[PDB]
Amino acid sequence: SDKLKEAETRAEFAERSVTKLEKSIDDLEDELYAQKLKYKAISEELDHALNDMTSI
Amino acid sequence: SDKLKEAETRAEFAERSVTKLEKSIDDLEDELYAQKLKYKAISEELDHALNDMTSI
Amino acid sequence: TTALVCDNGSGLVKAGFAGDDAPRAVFPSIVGRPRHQGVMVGMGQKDSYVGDEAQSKRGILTLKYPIEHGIITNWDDMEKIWHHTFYNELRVAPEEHPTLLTEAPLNPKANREKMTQIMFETFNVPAMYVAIQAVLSLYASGRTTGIVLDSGDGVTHNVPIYEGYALPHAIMRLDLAGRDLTDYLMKILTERGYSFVTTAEREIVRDIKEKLCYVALDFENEMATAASSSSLEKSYELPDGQVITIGNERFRCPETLFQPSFIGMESAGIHETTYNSIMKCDIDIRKDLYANNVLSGGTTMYPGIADRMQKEITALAPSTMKIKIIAPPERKYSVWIGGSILASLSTFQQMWISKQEYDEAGPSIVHRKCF
Amino acid sequence: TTALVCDNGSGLVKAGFAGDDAPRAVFPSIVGRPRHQGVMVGMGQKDSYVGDEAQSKRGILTLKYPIEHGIITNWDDMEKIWHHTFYNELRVAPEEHPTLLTEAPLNPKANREKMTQIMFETFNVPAMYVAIQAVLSLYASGRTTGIVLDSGDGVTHNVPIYEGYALPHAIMRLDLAGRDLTDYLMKILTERGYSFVTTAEREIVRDIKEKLCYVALDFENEMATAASSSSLEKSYELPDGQVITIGNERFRCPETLFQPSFIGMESAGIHETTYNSIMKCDIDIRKDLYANNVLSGGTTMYPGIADRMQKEITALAPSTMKIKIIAPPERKYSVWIGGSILASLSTFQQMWISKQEYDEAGPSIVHRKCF
Ligand SMILES: Nc1ncnc2c1ncn2[C@@H]1O[C@H](COP(=O)(O)OP(=O)(O)O)[C@@H](O)[C@H]1O
Ligand SMILES: Nc1ncnc2c1ncn2[C@@H]1O[C@H](COP(=O)(O)OP(=O)(O)O)[C@@H](O)[C@H]1O
Numbered sequence: 001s002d003k004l005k006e007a008e009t010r011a012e013f014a015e016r017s018v019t020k021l022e023k024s025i026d027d028l029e030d031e032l033y034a035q036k037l038k039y040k041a042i043s044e045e046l047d048h049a050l051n052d053m054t055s056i
Numbered sequence: 057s058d059k060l061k062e063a064e065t066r067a068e069f070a071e072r073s074v075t076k077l078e079k080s081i082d083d084l085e086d087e088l089y090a091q092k093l094k095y096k097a098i099s100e101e102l103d104h105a106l107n108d109m110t111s112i
Numbered sequence: 113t114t115a116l117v118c119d120n121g122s123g124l125v126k127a128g129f130a131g132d133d134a135p136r137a138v139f140p141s142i143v144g145r146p147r148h149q150g151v152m153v154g155m156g157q158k159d160s161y162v163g164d165e166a167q168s169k170r171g172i173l174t175l176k177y178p179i180e181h182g183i184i185t186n187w188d189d190m191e192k193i194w195h196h197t198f199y200n201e202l203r204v205a206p207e208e209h210p211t212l213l214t215e216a217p218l219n220p221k222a223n224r225e226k227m228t229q230i231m232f233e234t235f236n237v238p239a240m241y242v243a244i245q246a247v248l249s250l251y252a253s254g255r256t257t258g259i260v261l262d263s264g265d266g267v268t269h270n271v272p273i274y275e276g277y278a279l280p281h282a283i284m285r286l287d288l289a290g291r292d293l294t295d296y297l298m299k300i301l302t303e304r305g306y307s308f309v310t311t312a313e314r315e316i317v318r319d320i321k322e323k324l325c326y327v328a329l330d331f332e333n334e335m336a337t338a339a340s341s342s343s344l345e346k347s348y349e350l351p352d353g354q355v356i357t358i359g360n361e362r363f364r365c366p367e368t369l370f371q372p373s374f375i376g377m378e379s380a381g382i383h384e385t386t387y388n389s390i391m392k393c394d395i396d397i398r399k400d401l402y403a404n405n406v407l408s409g410g411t412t413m414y415p416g417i418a419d420r421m422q423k424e425i426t427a428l429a430p431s432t433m434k435i436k437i438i439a440p441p442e443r444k445y446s447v448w449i450g451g452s453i454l455a456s457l458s459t460f461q462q463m464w465i466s467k468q469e470y471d472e473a474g475p476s477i478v479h480r481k482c483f
Numbered sequence: 484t485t486a487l488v489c490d491n492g493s494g495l496v497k498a499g500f501a502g503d504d505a506p507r508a509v510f511p512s513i514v515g516r517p518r519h520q521g522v523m524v525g526m527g528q529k530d531s532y533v534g535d536e537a538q539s540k541r542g543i544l545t546l547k548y549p550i551e552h553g554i555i556t557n558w559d560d561m562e563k564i565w566h567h568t569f570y571n572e573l574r575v576a577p578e579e580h581p582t583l584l585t586e587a588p589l590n591p592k593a594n595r596e597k598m599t600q601i602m603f604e605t606f607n608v609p610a611m612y613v614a615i616q617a618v619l620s621l622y623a624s625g626r627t628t629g630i631v632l633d634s635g636d637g638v639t640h641n642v643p644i645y646e647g648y649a650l651p652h653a654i655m656r657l658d659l660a661g662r663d664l665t666d667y668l669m670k671i672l673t674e675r676g677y678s679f680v681t682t683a684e685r686e687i688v689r690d691i692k693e694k695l696c697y698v699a700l701d702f703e704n705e706m707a708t709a710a711s712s713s714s715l716e717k718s719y720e721l722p723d724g725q726v727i728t729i730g731n732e733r734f735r736c737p738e739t740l741f742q743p744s745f746i747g748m749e750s751a752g753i754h755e756t757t758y759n760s761i762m763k764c765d766i767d768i769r770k771d772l773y774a775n776n777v778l779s780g781g782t783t784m785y786p787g788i789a790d791r792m793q794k795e796i797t798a799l800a801p802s803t804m805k806i807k808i809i810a811p812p813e814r815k816y817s818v819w820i821g822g823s824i825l826a827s828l829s830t831f832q833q834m835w836i837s838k839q840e841y842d843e844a845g846p847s848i849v850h851r852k853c854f
């Protein structure tokens with residue numbers, strides 16, 4: 001009985017940890033996507049600048 | 057005894073899964089660090105071009 | 113010879129020879145005189161059962177801890193505990209072994225001086241050294257920086273360290289610890305009908321706290337959930353039957369750590385005294401302390417505390433810094449493992465307070481260079 | 484063999500072998516003893532971190548520059564800095580290499596004599612020569628005339644030269660430089676709420692000054708614009724988060740150069756001491772000095788200074804003369820590049836102060852023919 005209780009508690013702890021880790025990794029992926037979006041926006045602005053500089 | 061074996065197996069799988077998730081989040085955090093370095097460098101280069109052009 | 117790494121603590125005395133992985137003998141630090149009369153003759157009844165023997169005869173004893181909050185309030189009982197630890201749990205005479213006690217930060221001087229005087233006069237050790245309980249817990253993690261929150265059973269203290277240079281002006285010692293959580297749990301259990309009063313039943317409430325309580329990730333949501341469903345009610349069998357069912361007392365007992373207003377204490381929780389301890393440090397080592405927050409001590413073993421604390425600090429701290437909370441699985445014995453590592457070092461071998469030095473300067477030697 | 488072109492400076496020590504384009508090792512000249520106690524044993528903690536190592540552990544050090552204003556105020560620390568420069572940043576023993584130090588104009592004699600005595604007795608170099616920091620900056624520009632304004636970090640001096648003949652009566656040395664601008668910026672940042680006090684946070688204020696401040700073309704118009712719009716407010720992230728926003732402190736910090744009344748100094752700005760230095764020269768070489776005004780030194784790297792200075796001098800000077808300001812992109816290392824060029828010359832190879840000469844006349848040899 002003692003061993004079973006220990007195992008059950010371990011399982012609950014690990015499950016909660018996996019839930020937190022999944023949420024955190026999803027949030028960090030969202031942040032990376034946002035920063036990539038900003039980089040792409042300024043890169044397209046610079047590409048337009050280069051297109052005009054082709055006439056420069 | 058049978059129930060203890062089952063619970064121990066599921067807890068061990070949960071531990072392995074959380075280890076895999078922690079490694080994955082480490083990888084993605086490192087990738088975000090690299091992209092943050094990229095944005096830092098590109099903004100620094102843009103500022104350098106700005107100061108060179110304003111200062112001839 | 114080998115050194116004895118004793119660690120008085122408050123609630124569990126942990127001892128063992130230097131250079132191992134785990135303490136050799138771990139037993140509660142309680143000394144309980146019998147309280148009833150006693151009619152059987154020749155039963156061999158002693159006058160005081162100490163250590164783990166008094167956790168089996170606790171039905172007819174009055175257990176009383178000799179260490180209240182880090183400080184020692186009853187020197188005779190503490191001497192008895194030390195004598196038991198040396199002679200019966202380790203069976204090594206102290207005349208041939210150096211000792212390395214541990215002491216909480218910001219404790220009264222007289223306590224430390226009396227400790228060294230006892231160790232040198234009564235037990236007559238060759239040399240003893242007193243170390244702060246947080247530096248050892250930092251040793252055990254294998255780090256050299258970081259801010260360690262050592263929430264023991266007597267007192268919770270938070271010592272920040274950088275590059276090996278401790279910051280004496282940033283130590284935040286708070287007297288809420290496991291014992292107050294036991295008393296608060298014993299006080300809120302009365303809301304269902306279970307009354308524990310005797311000093312022996314405090315041990316039963318402690319067992320309930322250890323086996324059932326957990327720290328909620330978000331307090332209000334848990335309070336709302338436990339008040340609607342019944343998926344939280346876990347039952348527990350007393351030492352005589354009559355199982356009890358703990359409802360939302362499960363996460364309300366350890367919540368006192370983050371809201372010390374529950375037991376009437378004014379100060380802020382362990383989630384905000386760490387941030388305050390960091391902010392007192394210099395502006396250039398705050399990132400490293402943020403990234404290397406260390407947990408230790410017994411009371412930090414609640415299931416789900418390493419996530420609640422990280423969430424709270426991330427809420428308080430600036431959004432750019434990375435907050436990481438080191439929670440090794442061997443949290444309970446972290447201080448003693450660090451003590452073993454420190455005693456096993458060659459560079460440390462000349463820092464002991466040798467007996468001839470004590471004979472020349474008296475017990476006040478401990479405050480001197482040999483710290 | 485090759486010569487060592489060291490350049491003590493005040494704020495950044497720049498060194499490297501003669502004949503290259505850029506100094507091999509550039510690192511701040513600060514020596515910082517630890518100030519806290521230190522609890523980890525065997526961590527290998529040294530007693531003084533010098534150079535670029537103390538810019539990474541600056542959170543627990545007390546950095547102190549060994550050179551205040553050109554002159555050297557703490558000879559032991561300067562000796563330590565030189566020893567580090569020779570042995571760890573270049574890894575060449577000084578017993579087999581001539582050295583070419585640099586010194587500001589109008590400095591105390593004892594400083595120069597002690598410098599040569601150290602170089603000949605402690606490090607035991609074969610031969611060393613001391614050169615004025617402005618002639619080298621004129622070498623690097625490839626000119627042979629011109630008036631050079633070498634606004635370093637310690638002291639700003641303005642040496643006019645014509646056809647290779649220096650004019651000793653027209654050197655105007657002013658003690659406002661980058662360090663005073665750092666202190667003034669640290670003093671005006673307090674008007675928004677940001678308080679930097681520790682000697683470690685002076686480095687953070689220096690970084691703010693380097694990355695954000697710029698010299699305004701017209702001061703009153705900028706003061707009026709920054710007080711109405713908000714197009715100037717640039718933000719900056721401290722070493723721990725909590726971004727700060729610098730408003731009209733951006734162009735008010737380096738404006739002190741042209742109005743030294745801001746920090747209470749009486750003298751006139753760098754825009755008017757150049758004109759005064761020119762007017763002390765003879766009437767027939769003023770056109771050439773007007774046309775070949777040279778900028779050097781670190782502090783002349785502010786974005787937009789080569790236009791403000793030209794506008795000011797054109798306002799002061801007669802309307803017919805052409806005012807041209809030479810501002811090479813390699814301004815910071817201009818003195819060291821010139822030093823390398825001078826040390827690489829064949830005609831210069833017999834001007835070194837050979838050791839036997841020092842043995843015969845003592846340290847006072849430097850003031851003699853071997854200047
Ligand atoms: N597994 C656990 N879960 C929750 N609380 C625990 C656990 N183990 C110990 N504790 C609490 O920690 C206390 C022991 O702390 P400990 O680290 O031994 O204190 P000390 O610093 O005096 O050695 C006990 O009183 C108990 O209340
Ligand atoms: N890019 C920059 N923009 C503005 N100021 C700078 C810049 N680089 C350096 N400085 C200032 O110049 C100083 C360095 O001057 P430096 O030429 O190294 O002095 P020295 O003559 O002693 O070598 C620094 O203290 C800094 O305040």
Ligand SMILES: [Mg+2]
Binds near residue numbers: 121262265409410447
């Ligand atoms: Mg402890």
Ligand SMILES: [Mg+2]
Binds near residue numbers: 493616635780
């Ligand atoms: Mg210079």
